[PDB]
């Protein structure tokens, strides 16, 4: 499920190729894991009992927008509306196991927030995987004459692979050193919970 939303989101983020099914499965597993794992009350105004009334992403995005055709622009705009939970409440709730882990039927604002978060996760994952793949190819870089009838014109572009996604996920799970500053000088193994990237 949600394979096609994944494909559209990858296309939006810079993956114009045709990723295989394993990449989709891995990304869906990651997103499902994160979702299942998942002014303000603590603002300064809360110190008192009674309240009173008041009174590089951008550069790349612009370059790509300037560097696309009308048909490409239409396709990009149409894919930009891809969502995990847009008018798919029941399907998402079945794919998210709401009943088994929480009281059923929350408000739709929660669903909108979840869709926004999922879009962000997919965007970040694709953006990092592209860099990892490019670096691998760049390091790696450094016989049929005549011709056939079904030969591709120029080829040259390939999609990302499961290993790139796994490496990006490992890179995303690292925490700041402030969560380890209290284990300096000791031999204590660090153990924590899943990080919500």
């Amino acid at each position: 499920a949600n394979w096609f939303e994944l494909c559209q989101m990858m296309y939006v983020s810079g993956e114009t190729g045709e990723p295989s099914l394993e990449t989709t499965g891995i990304i869906e597993d990651i997103v499902r894991q994160q979702v299942i794992e998942i002014g303000l009350p603590w603002e300064p105004a809360s110190f008192y009992s009674v309240e009173v009334p008041e009174r590089q992403r951008l550069r790349k995005a612009d370059e790509r927008t300037k560097a696309m055709t009308k048909e490409e622009y239409v396709t990009w705009s149409e894919f930009r509306q891809a969502s995990f939970t847009y008018r798919k409440g029941k399907r998402f709730r079945e794919w998210a196991g709401f009943g088994l882990v929480t009281d059923s039927k929350p408000s739709d604002d929660i669903i909108d927030i979840l869709g926004f978060l999922t879009f962000e996760m997919v965007q970040t994952l694709t953006e990092e995987a592209l860099k990892i793949k490019e670096q691998e190819d760049l390091h790696r870089e450094r016989l049929t004459g005549g011709g056939g009838l079904f030969d591709p014109p120029n080829e040259g572009r390939t999609p990302v692979e499961p290993r790139h996604i796994q490496e990006a996920f490992r890179r995303l799970q690292q925490r700041p050193k402030k969560a380890r500053a209290m284990l300096n000088g000791t031999k204590l193994q660090q153990r924590t919970q899943l990080k919500l990237f």
Binding site: G25, D29, Q135, R142, P162, I165, Q166, Q189
Partner: protein, 154 residues
Amino acid sequence: KLPIPKVLHDKAIQMPQPVPNIGGAGSGRPTYTQPALPKTPAFQLEGEGERVLNKKKLDELVRQVCGGTAEGQDGNMLTPEVEESVLNMADAFVDNVLHQACRNAKERGSKVLEIRDIQLVLERVYNIRIPGYAKVQPNSNWIKKMSAVQAAKV
């Protein structure tokens, strides 16, 4: 006679599938001796070869985690005394993880080793999470004791 049915069942008409070499006698023995369609062995016509890829693997990892290497230099990123330590680390990790996982699997009555046991060991003893492979509450006595203590406190 014999009961030739008017139509065969689905098990007889099968379109055979490749099969492995079972029995344990061994394969490739040039002595005196079969499935319908045996499976082809594995071969490589020409390329770098495993003897090179396996050796280059460690330098590849060092390049990955080192950030990057400039032109005109590579490979010699670990001194001779550190590669041995890294290899010992790898072997010990593999052995320990497998030894723990097999016993853990056998504990719960299973007769085969599944990925779940390895994943549990890695998560709960090493803080490693590999993706893409598929609570507690108190009882009544504790609540009663807390209520008694709180009542005595006031």
